[PDB]
Write a protein that binds this ligand. Structure first.
Ligand code: G39
Ligand code: G39
Ligand code: G39
Ligand code: G39
Lengths: 385, 385, 385, 385
């Protein structure tokens, strides 16, 4: 039976460690895929880890310039959470250098994008079989979430971008049933910039917190009904969420220009006017990670907050981070539980190696107490190469 | 319940990437099988990749002269689509240096040929247990499809050749049920030459497009009803499908002798008087791949065609290619969906390695739009050896 | 249906070899996890081996200081009994450097403790999803069993410690249902020291034999009802079970102070006033192992016993050992079968390697005859390093 | 439902190849266990390969003196037929240096002997849980089949030996239900010698053809009803089946003393007064294998025969071989089908390496035709060592 998403986000006090895959430490010897853009998404029975491989293993020559981003060998595969991604435990999903995926209660929907930069195509699959296709409409790198999509009452939603990662680009929301596009709407978002959105379902509606790689240090959002009627904005909190970003201060409900000319994928959970913010600890590099609870931070502008919980130390490498949900039909709870993952990027451009790849760690909602600490990748570089 | 095959091929506009195993790039370090002759075939529940191993792994000494073709260690195995063939994820099917396979809706049927060249024997299995045997009748390398057989209303059919790959040889169509040959017929096709046929079910009948290794540059075909009543011909198009072959020009409905003394296994999908032709890009070697729609090309002699979709660039190695299907019981559609796979050969005799193996990529029908691009093997030879 | 735990320990005579994973001998080449603190636990259908990896593999550089005990990369995983723990056959369970686990008949309950020594938090999971959390109440290394928990009539119970591994500490017994803590009690055990308890169900109650690391050469025990009403004491048998320990002699029903300033993890099965004692053969190091039947050494003080059954020769490295149970719902028997496992520790600090890890062996109850022997680890150190 | 064993052996004309695992060729690089004494057995759903590992992998130092036979690290494991035995694809079964196993229609019954030569104990397991124990009764290496046991109407029977491999030893037949010994009888076989019997069910009774290591070149046999009422004898054919053995000549219905002071495990299928013999091609060493049809050869004494089918050239190493069956509940047939396997031993003592391991190949009855050929191991020694 389909996942009803009419339930609300579960109240919580902190975050508890859920998984850690040590893929990079293990891959030092083991046959572990070199990856990037990993993300967790759960069905009504299990939770999986999706990722984009480089069609090569760690410590092998084919792992060479795996910093390039888009290639013909890039593929989307999955394995159960906490496990190291290997050819011996990974399920093939699709050929792709940018992807998304979600479970509607019945079957899995995977979105993989491949092809050249001037005409990339999104192949949609439902239970492994191709159910639709979406071709680039601006011919400038059609790309997507790199985190799970959201399903509600049997419909799943996602967000895509086409155009410059440099300035005004085109943005679209898509609704799908059985992996087929039943409706789509382009957002009329002049001056906004949307990339790699982390979307979750709450009370029958979707909410997405994304990345402004053009000119924002704070994160932009988009929420919508099952008819794609939407609203847009930026988190007004002075506790800036992008990286790079400036020192905390006075935020704005609009794009914060200072230092937001690049970025990193992230997420945030909205509760009333409050927001849980996941962000790096550094303001310049993808180092460290922490969770901050700013009550009344979604609508106000100030750098004051209530709680902060360490996830990774400033001295250790972090990277992308996304949100993922647990539905009542998998949990037995009467609310939609929030969790998040963090990508731990090793290699280039920061480290002198011939390769780039990443590990993952994840946490979940919870009302019981927690603790901040540091759960870093742990590999010692360089490798035998 | 048995796969019904009374439906027609789904109408289509282009091809959407379905998978890429990256086995060779992965095998540089991973315990991946050395193979050749890989093909895809689906049941009413999953799609799998079959292939002929060389009882050895990549980058190991036993990988030596793996260019030999036939030997006692050659075995037919399978794993899920897109995954690299390895001993930790592959199901053993049969001992064979030539095979075929298809699912009738109930169980898998596998056909593996082993034994000496002067008296080979095909072993038929149904759900993993031997159900029949077919021994060579001409005593000269009994061989078969190297791709999926076709099943209709409980019956599965295949084609086998016995005799010279050099000139006139004998060809037989077999009809089976629960893996037992209930009927067969020897094709009265003087001056024709059949090999590595790609057969597919359509409107209750089978259609096979094969390879002329004796004297044809265009491909031969055979279609037949469930009682083995058949018709034979050659694709008349001036867009020659074999490799080697001559530059495009005036085709023929009979064997085009120029350059057809050799060949490569291939496929083609017939729609009315039109055909989707899959072929290499080079006219001499196994380089590149492309999809071509020549309406009225199945019966007409002209090198004019409508659409062209690139799959593999001329600068990269390709190889065998075959057709495979997605029945309604698996898809939910009301038509039989056409898909294809391409074998990417690396090593001897074109590269200076001590071995020969291959990777695979596959695509499927689709009405939505698509894009041409290039999805090559990507491994850099030579290996550590 | 829930595992009723109202049956009694089956009457037995000796122990029969159940399993041996040779993980270390195998990892010399294979991709085996470097581990410690392993233990078995069974459901109503299968038996698994749980363990705490070091987020690295044998014979790889990351295997370095794997002697350190606690780290962020330490994770709790599991695989079927007898199989070598590997990233290709292990299910991820939880991030932890101390754990426990058991099956209530319906789903698996896992307990993984992580975080800093001054603020560790226990993450309880039921069927893979977080259901409760427990933070350190004495801010001094919250730790647990390192062996299975015990479930009765739908409820599972475990024991945890917080405070000095050096002297008087704080001990608590928890009661959980579907992984949620419904009740907890602190033992009023002045002068006692509980650590790494082995608890088993019997006649509707729980019995634990633990490790006194503070000042006992004999072992302490706790037994309690389903409402956490309890009783405490020490095994009085002059056949001292802790290691190190003094030569056998006159025991005590309280802490035997000579040599018991350290210890190792163990177990014991109480029968009437008698006991089956598992122990190392050495009085000083974790060398050798043997089972001893002191009929009524549970309450009596005399170093005399009836049967001795060798499990590992004095010349070979041994280590931790714990109890694990079969239930009637799994076995079909009408009694609770006792079984135990043994950790074979190789590496530091006794051998000159840069790492520490371990193999496992197990035995089960049984009435028919048996024989003692020696089933050591068998790996030859050092390794390629 | 239980496997009725009331049907008779299926009439056959030759033997078709069923599988080949290439375990050693693959092990050159892959993580393949080192093993000996492999054998196949089938349930009502699938066929598996059991084997006794040496607790190490090929091409690793721990693969050293793996020629010793018995050791504490020896374990019984299994994987699907055709697959190379590895720690990634192998199910653990029991600790043993001698074993047997069979499926009764409901669950697997495994038999694993371990312990010292003067007190070995066989641990029986039903569905993975210990159901009985049998201790040595002569204190001289209790040993068993090293192939599959036979099940009929819900009962499985096996054969065990205790005593000298040097002369008169004690032989016993065991009958078990759900893994528990319900009856047992000791054979009154003076001047007979039974070891490593291959037993198959037929018309509700069991027939075993074994190895005489004492003083016989021909093979001894025992057949018995479901109440262990039995009959013994020796195959009378002058086509001697043991190895070593003298050149073919005049056989004997009793022990043929010339050259039978040692031997190898083998098998045979009796049809009326005829027999299908499996044997090596060489009379001195375990080289080559072949099937021979000697009608009226079970009771007569002559070296003449009707059919001979080659399985392994004399130029290549063979080794143990045994029988296995496929019941009607698996095949759908109305008769019990005969098949067999052959162990291809490589290394010591015939080859200069530091190890000993084996590969496997198997065949099945079949009415259709077949062919003789040579399917050897194919590994090139020595290895990197
Ligand atoms: C094309 C711009 C896009 C959005 C900023 O770049 C991403 C940034 C990345 C990054 O900043 O690390 C890595 C992503 N793999 C890349 N996505 C693609 C499709 O190339
Ligand atoms: C024997 C002739 C036959 C048909 C052309 O050769 C094939 C051509 C091949 C090729 O052109 O690459 C490889 C196939 N492995 C081989 N088949 C067998 C059975 O050896
Ligand atoms: C903190 C004291 C505790 C009980 C004695 O130490 C254990 C002893 C050990 C040992 O004596 O070998 C190894 C365990 N990994 C360790 N547990 C933790 C959590 O560090
Ligand atoms: C102990 C005598 C017995 C029967 C002849 O020896 C077998 C012969 C063998 C052989 O001749 O190769 C190998 C078996 N692994 C061995 N079995 C045991 C248990 O040691």
């Amino acid at each position: 039976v389909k996942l009803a998403g009419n339930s609300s986000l579960c109240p919580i006090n902190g975050w508890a460690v859920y998984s850690k895959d040590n893929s990079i430490r293990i891959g030092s010897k083991g046959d572990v895929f070199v990856i990037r853009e990993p993300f967790i998404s759960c069905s009504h029975l299990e939770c999986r880890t999706f990722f984009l491989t480089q069609g090569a293993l760690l410590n092998d020559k084919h792992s060479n310039g795996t910093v390039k981003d888009r290639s013909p060998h890039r593929t989307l595969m999955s394995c159960p959470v906490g496990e190291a991604p290997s050819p011996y435990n990974s399920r093939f999903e699709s050929v792709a250098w940018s992807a998304s995926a979600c479970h509607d209660g019945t079957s899995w929907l995977t979105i993989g994008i491949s092809g050249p930069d001037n005409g990339a195509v999104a192949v949609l699959k439902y239970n492994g079989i191709i159910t639709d296709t979406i071709k680039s409409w601006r011919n400038n790198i059609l790309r997507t979430q790199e985190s799970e999509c959201a399903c509600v009452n049997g419909s799943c939603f996602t967000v895509m971008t086409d155009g410059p990662s440099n300035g005004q680009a085109s943005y679209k929301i898509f609704k799908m049933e059985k992996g087929k596009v039943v409706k789509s709407v382009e957002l009329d978002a002049p001056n906004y910039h949307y990339e790699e959105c982390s979307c979750y379902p709450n009370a029958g509606e979707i909410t997405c917190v994304c990345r402004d790689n053009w000119h924002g240090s704070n994160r932009p959002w988009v929420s919508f009904n099952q008819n794609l009627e939407y609203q847009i904005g930026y988190i007004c909190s002075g506790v800036f969420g992008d990286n790079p970003r400036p020192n905390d201060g006075t935020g704005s409900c609009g794009p914060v220009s200072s230092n937001g000319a690049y970025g990193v994928k992230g997420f945030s959970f909205k509760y009333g006017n409050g927001v849980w913010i996941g962000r790096t600890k550094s303001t310049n590099s993808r180092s460290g990670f922490e969770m901050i609870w700013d009550p009344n931070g979604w609508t106000e502008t100030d750098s004051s907050f209530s709680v902060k919980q360490d996830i990774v130390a400033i001295t250790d490498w972090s990277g992308y981070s996304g949100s993922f949900v647990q539905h009542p039909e998998l949990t037995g709870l009467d609310c939609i539980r929030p969790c998040f993952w963090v990508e731990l990027i090793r290699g280039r451009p920061k480290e002198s190696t011939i390769w780039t790849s990443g590990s993952s760690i994840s946490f979940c909602g919870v009302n019981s107490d927690t603790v901040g600490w540091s759960w870093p990748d742990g590999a010692e570089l360089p490798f035998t190469i």
